[PDB]
Amino acid sequence: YDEAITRYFASQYVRAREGFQASEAENSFRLVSLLSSPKEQNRFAKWYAGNNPESPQNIYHNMIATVTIKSISFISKDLIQVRYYKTVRDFSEKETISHWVSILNFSYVNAHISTSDRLINPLGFQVSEYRSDPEV
Amino acid sequence: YDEAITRYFASQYVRAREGFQASEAENSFRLVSLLSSPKEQNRFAKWYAGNNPESPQNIYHNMIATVTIKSISFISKDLIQVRYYKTVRDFSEKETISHWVSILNFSYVNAHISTSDRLINPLGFQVSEYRSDPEV
Numbered sequence: 360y361d362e363a364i365t366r367y368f369a370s371q372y373v374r375a376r377e378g379f380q381a382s383e384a385e386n387s388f389r390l391v392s393l394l395s396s397p398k399e400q401n402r403f404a405k406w407y408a409g410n411n412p413e414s415p416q417n418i419y420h421n422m423i424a425t426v427t428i429k430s431i432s433f434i435s436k437d438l439i440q441v442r443y444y445k446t447v448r449d450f451s452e453k454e455t456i457s458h459w460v461s462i463l464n465f466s467y468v469n470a471h472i473s474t475s476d477r478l479i480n481p482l483g484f485q486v487s488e489y490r491s492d493p494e495v
Numbered sequence: 496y497d498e499a500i501t502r503y504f505a506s507q508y509v510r511a512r513e514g515f516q517a518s519e520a521e522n523s524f525r526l527v528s529l530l531s532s533p534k535e536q537n538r539f540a541k542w543y544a545g546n547n548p549e550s551p552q553n554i555y556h557n558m559i560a561t562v563t564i565k566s567i568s569f570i571s572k573d574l575i576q577v578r579y580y581k582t583v584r585d586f587s588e589k590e591t592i593s594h595w596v597s598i599l600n601f602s603y604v605n606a607h608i609s610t611s612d613r614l615i616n617p618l619g620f621q622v623s624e625y626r627s628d629p630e631v
Contacts, residue, residue, distance in 0.1 A: 363617040364500070370614045382518070428614060478506045478564060481499040 360467060360482065365439070366431045368394065368484040373441045373461050376403070377491060378426040379419035393472075393480045396487045403489075423448045429458075439463045442494070457493060464488035496603060496618065501575070502567045504530065504620040509577045509597050512539070513627060514562040515555035529608075529616045532623045539625075559584045565594075575599045578630070593629060600624035
């Protein structure tokens with residue numbers, strides 16, 4: 360597939376996973392899930408669970424966190440690197456900014472998506488491994 | 496290009512154009528614009544302008560309108576039909592529902608998108624003509 364469409368879905372993946380807005384949680388959750396493999400979907404879920412202090416639900420409770428993409432490059436054929444910053448906003452409107460890099464291991468599966476899940480994942484994009492750490 | 500990716504962008508187009516949420520307006524505006532031709536972008540803009548009673552900004556002021564896709568089919572090679580319903584919500588949470596069909600005339604241009612506009616429009620999807628009317 361085209362590099363452009365691959366960048367497009369990595370950007371989506373990271374914007375959805377690494378940002379947060381109460382009104383969009385259900386949607387951002389289904390989308391990260393659909394674009395993650397069975398075994399990555401499950402790691403993501405344990406991390407997102409409402410009982411987990413490190414879940415966006417919690418650390419951005421009553422806040423909005425918005426990812427802005429800085430860059431997308433490929434370390435290898437199946438290994439993408441997304442550098443972005445998060446802009447976190449609260450009741451006072453006081454914006455905090457931080458910078459981050461995520462590595463994604465990805466592929467495209469010719470699995471079966473229903474017609475309506477294909478409007479979220481048209482080509483079986485699948486992140487098998489993922490991390491996010493802050494920058495220098 | 497693949498039918499699946501074409502359905503994907505028509506669904507996006509209609510969800511963004513035909514729904515409304517104050518927090519997402521700027522984003523929904525850039526996205527419809529990027530996926531519309533110069534001459535369609537301009538019709539959309541006159542329609543969306545804050546001074547226009549029929550603009551979503553206005554008719555959904557203080558509301559959230561959410562499009563749910565019912566179906567996407569092709570009347571011809573360049574002519575797509577998107578049947579959807581809108582779920583409109585207000586201060587009281589009282590949901591009104593209506594049903595609609597949109598026709599889109601579309602193509603893919605090998606024009607120049609900047610690297611960052613390509614994260615919204617990776618393949619130069621372009622709606623040249625558009626309408627929306629209610630159903631039976």
